[PDB]
Design a protein around this ligand. Structure first.
Ligand SMILES: Cc1cc2nc3c(=O)[nH]c(=O)nc-3n(C[C@H](O)[C@H](O)[C@H](O)COP(=O)(O)OP(=O)(O)OC[C@H]3O[C@@H](n4cnc5c(N)ncnc54)[C@H](O)[C@@H]3O)c2cc1C
Ligand SMILES: Cc1cc2nc3c(=O)[nH]c(=O)nc-3n(C[C@H](O)[C@H](O)[C@H](O)COP(=O)(O)OP(=O)(O)OC[C@H]3O[C@@H](n4cnc5c(N)ncnc54)[C@H](O)[C@@H]3O)c2cc1C
Ligand SMILES: Cc1cc2nc3c(=O)[nH]c(=O)nc-3n(C[C@H](O)[C@H](O)[C@H](O)COP(=O)(O)OP(=O)(O)OC[C@H]3O[C@@H](n4cnc5c(N)ncnc54)[C@H](O)[C@@H]3O)c2cc1C
Ligand SMILES: Cc1cc2nc3c(=O)[nH]c(=O)nc-3n(C[C@H](O)[C@H](O)[C@H](O)COP(=O)(O)OP(=O)(O)OC[C@H]3O[C@@H](n4cnc5c(N)ncnc54)[C@H](O)[C@@H]3O)c2cc1C
Lengths: 386, 386, 386, 386
């Protein structure tokens, strides 16, 4: 069909997928938000579908899907369970994506098959206690030893950090030429869950996405073989930025899914709830919110589809991925907040899903580049183009 | 001192009060947000101070404070514990306020002393499952019987609903002349916790203000004596509106307190957290948020002080109370959301208080008149004045 | 290349078109904004580009272009002269579009060739002094007489009202079945500039779009032949609604053009203007404004391209055209206001074009359905879909 | 009565003042916006009200009014004529205020009587073509010569620049110790309109405030006596900062006046204009805009009254004046834009005053410190307080 809508082939995949989500994922979303229990059962079931190898080429045991279709799949998952959407998006975009992007043929044959089947979930460790937005300020170090490297440092807020079977960690291998250029000298390392040298820190409770595994990683004299070095030594940061460009498309889709769920719930609610003798949807104070949210969410969807298209075409998309994530996350969180408002007192109670949608969506304005950082990324590119 | 700042007499009360809050209330705020355990210990300690009889005249065993001072006290409590602030604000403004406003000398001597000492917490039941914003659409009925009345109906989201010793419930005693004028025929009833006829429904879990008691009340053939009728029969709605005007000043103050706590935390954090070689407070993306929030919160404070002043002067303040609550709640929630953003990933974790500040403040845009309802109230008054 | 980009065919047309605009239209834009002198000379030259018969089939002497290409052409014109863009958009979308939509073969052969060549500009009269948003409340009457009709009424703010050679006027021919169905009974009439019966009222000075011809039309027992009736008698308002859907796509494009011009100017200015030792573009207070505007403008463009595509595909597009116009107009006006701010004092002086961009763009949130009306159109469609 | 209301004394002054404004100023406001003709006649009459020497002590021939009363007077003027309000505010706050602040007894006796009577209007020249927000980067030089100084430089956008009888110009007299301390070495010079050495450049057309005199000043080896030095040599910028604090209070009041005029007009219009069978004020899309604007404008007024009070009390008010100006200007411009929207097409025509209100108010977010600069001033004060 038309570029902006789901084509026949996309519907053939997404239609059945959405029914699976409604039947198997939706029922326990509220409970998972309360308990935080990692959904191993659903991971297993999704993995059997190839969801955890979505972007991985079929040659490596993956589904070989396009960025566009995978993004739509993430939106679909997020509509029913934000935590699961983050689990799926991060696994595919970050750890797996980085190995697919910079891995040698040997590394891709060793890691990709296990990641694509779900046998091994992937964790991507960039952020640290002292550095997030300024990611190049990381302090984890990698020193050269006989047979490989010795890693020492701490990673903060790592998704799948405690359940991962494969880890990709960024560490400094060489001194930076200057503080302005501290990105130089950083390398990436890919390795299977260590027998020793890696421990999970005190788990933090989160505002939302309860069931998503987020943990602190403490690396103490962790040994990794020579084959662990991912990409060229000291040039890992450029690769990190390319990985985040792709990851941002997934987060944009995640945001749209959560915002759409909130809008859909508010629309249905406003049509059935009456006040002053008529459905509240008849008051502009409610209908205008619905119209604005619907419009912004459609705009956000078009933006992430555009970014995905550029990536699928092998063209630069840094600016476009940033714009998509920025707009989708900001619009989605606003839509969720308006949905809470439309339900009134009921929007403040956990028996209804809207308060969870907001709590889950709220992280999309922070993860993989805060909205502030993205505005810098966007402005810089705009100014360069004069 | 100058009208807009705390005078010497106000500081004499608030200064020591704030230290008490820092030492006895602040320490357990996070735990109460997780467990929802009603703070009986703190209620007892505050009650000994007269906090639960703040507006009640000294003749009835109250503290006889001004609306202005009580509002500042609510802001102070909210700064450290939103749930406790709501408990204090609702008890004083609604149940107690309604009895003080419309009670006969006999009723005030019977109820006020117990409410002012905290021996009896007050619950005010207006809202029902089918009516909130359109409060005059309530369905609870009061039928005249020998010796008094028989009440039947359900109240929704009632603060102190399960722990109250005194209840004030609104019910229809006479048929409305028309749907446009359904407010006519509604009466208010004040009574001590019933030996029978009243039961607490399934408790709902909330987005925030966890430790604040919120319950559904089910009235089944509840008998109340003739002396229970509060105000004139069928004219209780006008009184309800006057009670809400006063209550809105307290909620405005509550919002300001929560927003100020968020701003203060973000300011301190931004000064100590460094990125790209400098405190993040040095980046306009952060400092502009701080400046805007500080400015809006000060404006909100001036607005609630103005409303309080008018009430203390015995002058109309419906428009002013609505403006104060509308602006304070909207500004406070925005400030809290910006504080989450400034802390970044840390703003999304429960080890820090900012995510709780937002969750607690979020109800202020809904309770005692949603922002939408308040805009209607304000616009109507503006248009009447031409 | 990709759907959202200009295709090979589009570039071959838009490339030289833009060159013409920069050389012949841009130079006098500022002067026209000051004098309001209608650009008859530019109209003649533009007519050569197919621009005054863009959507009219080649059979009737038009250019036979797609809605998508025409929309891009309107954005291009708007980038350099907002008044000219409105002249082109209205002529094509309203008067011409209505005749193309409901005209009989005889009417199309008689009117379209003259409109499509620019020899006769078209004016569309719907709005009246007492009705705009509530367009079906028009009072202009059309009484049936021997061999035709006699029209009496006043039309307000009609584009091309004083310079038009062809007029399309909506007038009531039959009584409305009920006040709720007042849209029934309205007919459309197409006719050439009469010798009498039509006079132009006191010209009003406008905030922007100075050179765009806007006038009040006073119909005084204006006679029109039987052949003047456009569409089915009493079904004129239905055609009007269809005409507005198409028109809104053009206004959305117009808005994007003006907003893009403001953004581009602000970007160039911020890169060259220094303060405190560096380009002001290096301060986030400035760069964040630029990033947000750019993000919203690109979403707005995607929205109008989507609406144009649906129209070209013969599919429903009422909802989509409303979303495009609403989003684009609101985003463009904000971007223009931000540009004024970025230029500081220079943004307040007419020597620079940004203040004009805002004044011109400001009408896009009002014309062809105010933003408020569009939110209603949007909400209704969303709710009807359940 | 209450602090925030007009006191007995204020009403006795403002009552007749407002009557004068409505009778003598309001009638020609629209015409002056079209012609830009400086209102010399109104200046003479206003001078009678003490308005051109409002803050000047009676000893020096002034009115000896409080900052609070003067601020209310500026709001009153702005309500009817924005250009006149700027003329009064700038004359009083800048040129006159600077001489009153740093002038010696001899300078005050020589300048103030003439400025305070309106016989000599005052121009304050700080801004230059290359420096505005970064005011300390001024390039105008003051070389020491026999019996005085010789000034060379260009001043940009100077209010009263071409009609002033007294000029206060900032020029560098000594080299800056370092680029970071460039504010040191700047001096102020007060002098009467010279016979040569000062010429007015090409007048620029403005977006609004048409009748306000604004001009570029070219100083060409302009000689001024030793007595021209205002304040301590090289310490002129410190006085400049103090002058701006006071000026910002006046601009805040100006903004409130314009915003209030727009709000009042929109309220009256919405009550009388009907659509779809009822006053448009009955649609929340319109009434919510009115309620928000009214709420923000009253907060803005409270903020400027607070700042004025602190100044009158001899207490610090830098932070407060910045907050007042920032809030008032932003709120007023938004209210004016909403008024344009509420009038629909009529809001876009000059026959109605709302488009002028917006154009006039728009400068308040730029003059005497852009909103961006004010947020910096605010943030710095907040952070210094820890
Ligand atoms: C639930 C969750 C899951 C996550 N999963 C992963 C993961 O799987 N892998 C991984 O590596 N990381 C992960 N993260 C970390 C996340 O990427 C970082 O939190 C984020 O990139 C930076 O946030 P921060 O906490 O470092 O805040 P900071 O970087 O300290 O920033 C704090 C505030 O300062 C602002 N700021 C900083 N610099 C500037 C500037 N120059 N201009 C303007 N504003 C600025 C920021 O926008 C923010 O508002 C996760 C975080 C969370 C909460
Ligand atoms: C934690 C909590 C504590 C509370 N405590 C008390 C208490 O102590 N005592 C008590 O009596 N009640 C209490 N309430 C109830 C509260 O007052 C009501 O929820 C509120 O007044 C109305 O909300 P609602 O749930 O009825 O939503 P509704 O009234 O159904 O409204 C839903 C949405 O429609 C909007 N809307 C409705 N009408 C219009 C209109 N005409 N125009 C535009 N928009 C409209 C509302 O603004 C809202 O966005 C409490 C609620 C909560 C959540
Ligand atoms: C420069 C210019 C060119 C124009 N050219 C043409 C033309 O070529 N042909 C033509 O026929 N007309 C033309 N118009 C008129 C334009 O179409 C109308 O102005 C518009 O459709 C309705 O605006 P109005 O002035 O009637 O405002 P109103 O309809 O009176 O509305 C006033 C305010 O009330 C709001 N409002 C009204 N109803 C509701 C509601 N139900 N809910 C919420 N808000 C509501 C509106 O949004 C607006 O904010 C032009 C106008 C201008 C200024
Ligand atoms: C009608 C009018 C009357 C005036 N009257 C007077 C007068 O009487 N006397 C006088 O001396 N001047 C006067 N001015 C000038 C006015 O004071 C200056 O324009 C203003 O102080 C600075 O604006 P600028 O044009 O220099 O913009 P710039 O200083 O170049 O700033 C341009 C943009 O960059 C932003 N910016 C700059 N630095 C930063 C930063 N560090 N962080 C974030 N953003 C930044 C600004 O906010 C603005 O958005 C007047 C101007 C006008 C238009």
């Amino acid at each position: 069909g038309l570029w902006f809508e789901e084509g026949a082939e996309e519907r053939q995949v997404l239609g059945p997928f959405r029914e699976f989500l409604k039947a198997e994922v939706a029922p326990g979303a509220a409970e998972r938000d309360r308990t935080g229990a990692f959904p191993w059962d659903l991971v297993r079931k999704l993995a059997e579908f190839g969801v955890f190898g979505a972007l991985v080429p079929e040659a490596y045991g993956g589904a070989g899907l396009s960025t566009r279709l995978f993004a739509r799949m993430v939106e679909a998952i997020a509509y029913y369970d934000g935590a699961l959407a983050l689990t799926v998006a991060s696994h595919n975009s970050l750890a797996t994506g980085h190995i697919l992007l910079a891995g040698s043929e040997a590394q891709k044959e060793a890691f990709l098959p296990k990641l694509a089947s779900g046998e091994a979930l992937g964790a991507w460790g960039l952020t640290e206690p002292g550095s997030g937005s300024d990611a190049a300020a990381l302090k984890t170090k990698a020193e050269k030893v006989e047979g490989g490297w010795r890693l020492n440092g701490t990673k903060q807020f790592i998704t799948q950090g405690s359940v991962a079977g494969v880890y990709v960690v960024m560490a400094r291998t060489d001194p930076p030429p200057s503080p302005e250029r501290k990105h130089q000298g950083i390398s990436a390392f890919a390795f299977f869950r260590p027998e020793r040298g890696l421990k999970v820190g005190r788990k933090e409770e989160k505002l939302g996405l309860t069931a998503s595994d987020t943990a602190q990683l403490i690396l103490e004299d962790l040994f990794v073989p020579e084959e662990a070095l991912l990409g060229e030594r000291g040039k890992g940061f450029y690769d990190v930025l390319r990985v985040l460009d792709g990851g941002r498309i997934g987060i944009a889709a995640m945001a749209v899914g959560l915002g759409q769920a909130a809008l859909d719930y508010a629309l249905a609610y406003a049509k059935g709830r009456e006040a002053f003798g008529r459905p509240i949807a008849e008051f502009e104070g409610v209908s205008f919110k619905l119209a604005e949210a619907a419009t912004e969410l459609e705009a956000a969807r078009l933006l992430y589809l555009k970014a995905a298209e550029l990536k699928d075409a092998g063209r630069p998309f840094t600016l476009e991925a940033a714009q998509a994530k920025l707009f989708a996350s900001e619009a989605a969180v606003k839509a969720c907040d308006e949905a809470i408002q439309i339900l009134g007192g009921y929007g403040y109670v956990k028996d209804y899903p809207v308060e969870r949608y907001w709590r889950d969506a709220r992280l999309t304005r922070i993860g993989e580049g805060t909205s502030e950082i993205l505005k810098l990324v966007i402005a810089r590119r705009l100014l360069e183009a004069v």
